[PDB]
Design a protein around this ligand. Sequence first.
Ligand SMILES: *[C@H]1CC(=O)N(C2CC(C)(C)N(O)C(C)(C)C2)C1=O
Ligand SMILES: CC1(C)CC(N2C(=O)CCC2=O)CC(C)(C)N1O
Length: 366
Amino acid sequence: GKLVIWINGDKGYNGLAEVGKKFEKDTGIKVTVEHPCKLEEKFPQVAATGDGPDIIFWAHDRFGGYAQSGLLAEITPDKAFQDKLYPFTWDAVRYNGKLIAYPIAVEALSLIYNKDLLPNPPKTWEEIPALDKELKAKGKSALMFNLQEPYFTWPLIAADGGYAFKYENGKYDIKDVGVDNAGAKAGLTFLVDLIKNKHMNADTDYCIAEAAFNKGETAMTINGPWAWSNIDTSKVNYGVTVLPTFKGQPSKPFVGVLSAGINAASPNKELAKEFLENYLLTDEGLEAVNKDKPLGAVALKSYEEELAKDPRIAATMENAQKGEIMPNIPQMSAFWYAVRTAVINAASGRQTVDEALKDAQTRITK
Ligand SMILES: *[C@H]1CC(=O)N(C2CC(C)(C)N(O)C(C)(C)C2)C1=O
Ligand SMILES: CC1(C)CC(N2C(=O)CCC2=O)CC(C)(C)N1O
């Protein structure tokens, strides 16, 4: 007879609580928003015992494991509701063909650049080396980004043909892995050449690239919407744009989708679906939440069009439309560790590109 919702503390839960007051107005049903610690850890525990919230908000990737254990109710928005959101967003909340959540927001890396050092951002990765030599002439470098984590290097590695797992029907073929193809090989090779030609240092991490961009020492960086508040502070005159192409192919960053799922154990599923489809996933619902804490790019086409007047948000969506939805399956854990190792190894000379990737491919499909 009520609704309890769980959302992370770093989100606009005050705005969500406001959509809830509006719901309670035309229904009498009280909505309760909470943001417990490590709720994504707590969820699986309480839900397994038929407890927890009616609805949970989290990035889509985690939903795969939840769905596996039957913790989420199957959703059935009709065609009409479905057409209100970007098609690609529905792919993120499919677990073996079944729709298990509603897409809310979209996140993807973008190319961030210093408008004072660089008039126009490069359109290509191939032109970075040359640009770096011109900038070096003035004591500045072209680009610095986190080389340590595959989340950051994947856009380049995947550009010309790499992929984690072949997807073709709301289902992932776990024996169709794309880390050892020519595509990925072309990409990693380009990256390695950057480091050995000294256009990039193999030890650049998150902190180092971030400080460098914020100190105006480097012209570009690769980062996500969470990094914007830090740049603002810095007082750098920055722009956010589409990532560069490689071999004429778009960079393919992984896409994370903020999702809302219904507890399979809830007695209030009809209430949940009504709250979600008719209160929250409306221009006014996203707006009340966004006002509290920005969502970034959103899945609802109508509101995204309003938000896209901010070129940083437009760029985020563009990159996301060209990226790779992050697989929600358990085998993804193998991919993280394997590809992490392959890149650090190829980068440090410890192994060749051909070797490093052949190995990773092996450990994933193992
Ligand atoms: C209180 C707040 C919180 O997040 N937890 C969890 C979180 C982590 C991920 C550390 N966890 O695994 C357990 C041990 C389940 C505790 C709290 O207990
Ligand atoms: C002060 C500076 C430039 C950054 C620092 N750092 C971060 O900035 C974030 C996390 C961290 O450890 C670590 C090192 C030793 C590289 N140094 O020197």
